[PDB]
């Protein structure tokens, strides 16, 4: 999270940390008692690494009563996701057991209505990813407010050159951006999950290359089919 600051601990109880071999790998949002939504490209290079989800966390290292590390029973990448593209970059992880809900662990309802967020709208995104151009990572959760950028502008040849489909959305990236390690995390607009951070192969903070986010509403039927 470039250009932001440390969040209030446990003020976003849906925030999750997808872990690979006991280290933070990607963000994630709890969308059901036993399911966490994340980005499919997080697990492309994971190989046989141990995939776990850390819930109720603010600091990745310090002890906190609400922190609980869950094993993953089942990983469901979107069947049409591949390393070559950013399309369908969604991942659903089933926890070993239903999460212990509380004031620090609560599922976030995701947007089921397929409307674009009006441009300029400020949306909230959080993660444990890069926080400065030096590429270093923070221990406690960071967050920032980002204005939404319309798809046609985002598709200009200077920006993402027609790569932003109807199932994707952009936010400005001038000094404020989501970075590597924020992938799979939530882009909340109006207190509802609107987009999932993809990023991955993009350097952040360059206004020339806006941040990309997978619109959850475009994949409502699939999410329902997996969670059913």
């Amino acid at each position, epitope marked *: 999270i470039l250009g932001g600051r440390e969040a209030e601990a446990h003020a976003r109880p849906y925030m999750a940390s997808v872990q690979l071999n006991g280290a933070h790998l990607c963000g994630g949002v709890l969308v059901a008692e036993q399911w966490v939504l994340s980005a499919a490209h997080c697990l492309e290079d994971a190989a046989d690494g141990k995939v776990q989800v850390l819930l109720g966390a603010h600091s990745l290292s310090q002890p906190e009563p609400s922190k609980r590390l869950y094993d993953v029973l089942r990983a469901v990448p979107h069947p049409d996701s591949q390393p070559d593209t950013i399309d369908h970059d969604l991942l659903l992880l089933q926890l070993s057991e239903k999460a212990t809900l509380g004031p620090a662990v609560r599922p976030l309802p995701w947007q089921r209505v397929d409307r674009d967020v009006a*441009p300029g709208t400020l949306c909230d995104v959080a993660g444990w990813g890069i926080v400065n151009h030096a590429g270093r990572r923070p221990d406690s959760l960071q967050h920032v407010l980002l204005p939404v950028l*319309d*798809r*046609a*502008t985002c*598709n*200009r*040849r*200077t*920006h*993402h*050159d*027609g790569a*932003i*489909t*109807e199932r994707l959305m952009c936010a400005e990236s001038n000094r404020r951006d989501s970075c590597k390690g924020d992938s799979g995390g939530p882009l909340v607009c109006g207190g509802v999950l609107e987009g999932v951070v993809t990023s991955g192969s993009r350097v952040c903070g360059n206004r*020339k290359k806006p941040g990309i986010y997978t619109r959850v509403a475009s994949y409502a039927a699939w999410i329902d089919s997996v969670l059913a």
Partner: antibody
Amino acid sequence: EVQLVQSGAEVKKPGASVKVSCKASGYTFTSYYMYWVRQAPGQGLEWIGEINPTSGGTNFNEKFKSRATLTVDTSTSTAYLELSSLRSEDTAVYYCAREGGFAYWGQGTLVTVSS
Amino acid sequence: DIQMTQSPSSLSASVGDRVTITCKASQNVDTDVAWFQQKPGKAPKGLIRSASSRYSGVPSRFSGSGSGTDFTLTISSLQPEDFATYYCQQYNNYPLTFGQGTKVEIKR
């Protein structure tokens, strides 16, 4: 198959206005800017302006800002360029092109301005 | 306004020759440069964007180089259908500007 087809040739008097259309098909019209290029006979290319089809917002070359108008009918996936206060130096072929993705271009529209 | 100074104005070569076309920007435009091909009476056709990225269906013999101010269109093995006019375009800054063009003729 994606294609941008433009309206037919037009002949106008050194004072009238002209409105050229550019109907897109084969892709989501609202996902890409549309920019307009002009080419005088036996001459180079010249950038007129672009339009955001969802918001109607435009960015113009200052040379054309005062007397050009770009509009859009999202229901018919059509983009329009209106040039008023015509002069003989406006006699040229007018192209529409899509900003971003594969570089689709219209076939062109010839606009002749003479007395 | 950023000037795109294309060189040379015309150029004569044979089939199979390697040919170079040049475009110099009056200030940095990063890699926001595109190359177009145009044959008489037809609409311009896209070849390269982002200085070096070919479009789909463009033969591999076309290649683009450059970042900053100096950009180069290269045709490795000139084919008969390649003899035409080529334009460079800058889209880094409003207004977008073209080069005056380069005509590629057959040597005889």
